[PDB]
Structure formats: C-alpha cells, structure tokens
Design an enzyme around this catalytic site. Structure first.
Site: not given
Ligand SMILES: CC(=O)N[C@@H]1[C@@H](O)[C@H](O)[C@@H](CO)O[C@@H]1O
Length: 130
Positions: A35, A46, A49, A51, A53, A60
């Site tokens: 990750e 991202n 959408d 969002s 992380d 998220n």
C-alpha cells in the site's frame, strides 16, 4: 515516517495485530508494504471518485475516515484522516482493526487481493523476532 521492515513488524505486534480477526502479522506487513512502502505520510488521490487513501495502510476516505472533501463519504473509524498520517500508527491500527471487523476482513483492501492473497507472505517477518 518510513518504517524499517522489522521495526514495523514489532510495532504492529505490540499494538495487537498478530492474529487480529484471524489475520497474521505477515499479512499486515504485506499490506503495508504494497500500500505505502511502510510510509505513514503517504497519500493517494483517486480522481475517479474524489476520495483519498491515507497513511501506511492507504485507508480510503469514502468510508473510513473524514477529510471533509470527499463527497457522500462516511467515517466508520470516527477519526480525522489526519490521524492516519501520524508517525505513531496506533490510530491507524485502530482503524485497520475496524476495517477488518466488517465482512470482507483483510480483503477490504483491494490491493491485498492482488499482492498478498494466496502468496507466500512469510518473507515479510523473517528475522524480526515476531
Ligand atoms: C480498507 C480500504 O480503505 N479500502 C479501500 C476500498 O474501500 C476502495 O474502494 C479502494 C479504491 O481506491 O481503496 C481501498 O481498497
């Protein structure tokens, strides 16, 4: 901070992650490796959408933490996403534990399926004393 591998393994063990909801430490290590490269300050936006992380586990904002700027988001860990960017990972671990209390477990992180599932993950804890 960027953790050294075995430093992180022992840190996660002290925080109660070995076998949490059936998830071995080596799986948590594989997750953190792929990750974020063991990087607690890592972020990934991202654009699809809106969002983001956050942190060593790249948790998220659409579901798990609040950053205020993700539309139609919830905050199931009841934390500011800022808490997931600390050098101290206690809050990030508490949130990771909350994630895997839901049905998918460790599969909640899509990348774990691609990078850790049905793989030999023991290399990640070799020599760490855990
Ligand atoms: C535990 C966690 O934060 N999982 C999120 C997942 O919900 C999201 O749909 C995917 C897309 O970026 O990112 C992560 O896998």
């Amino acid at each position: 901070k960027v953790f050294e591998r075995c430093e992180l393994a022992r840190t996660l063990k002290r925080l109660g992650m070995d076998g949490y909801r059936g998830i071995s430490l080596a799986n948590w290590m594989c997750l953190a490796k792929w990750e974020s490269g063991y990087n607690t300050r890592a972020t990934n936006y991202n654009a699809g959408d809106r969002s983001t992380d956050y942190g060593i586990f790249q948790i998220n904002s659409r579901y798990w933490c609040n950053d205020g700027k993700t539309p139609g988001a919830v905050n199931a860990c009841h934390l500011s996403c800022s808490a997931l960017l600390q050098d101290n990972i206690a809050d990030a671990v508490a949130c990771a534990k909350r994630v895997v209390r839901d049905p998918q477990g460790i599969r909640a992180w899509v990348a774990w399926r691609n990078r850790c599932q049905n793989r030999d993950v023991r290399q990640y804890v070799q020599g760490c004393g855990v």
